[PDB]
């Protein structure tokens, strides 16, 4: 679960720069 | 606290693509 | 770190419905 | 990936409220 929202909250972070 | 972040982070997700 | 991570994220969801 | 989430959903967070 911590490696998949790793994955998950650190590009969905990004694309909310965006 | 894992397994229920996992389900409504999961779902939360979901619920902002659509 | 996850105990405050849940009282934030119930909370900061909760809001988010609102 | 604790560690570095809570400095980014600490400050992340704080973005928002502002």
Partial sequence: ???AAS???I???I???L
Same sequence: chains 1, 2, 3, 4.
Avoid: S
Wanted: hydrophobic share 85%; aromatic share 8%.
């Fill in 1 to 3: 679960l911590v490696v």
């Fill in 7 to 9: 994955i998950i909250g």
């Fill in 11 to 13: 590009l969905h972070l």
């Fill in 15 to 17: 694309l909310w720069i």
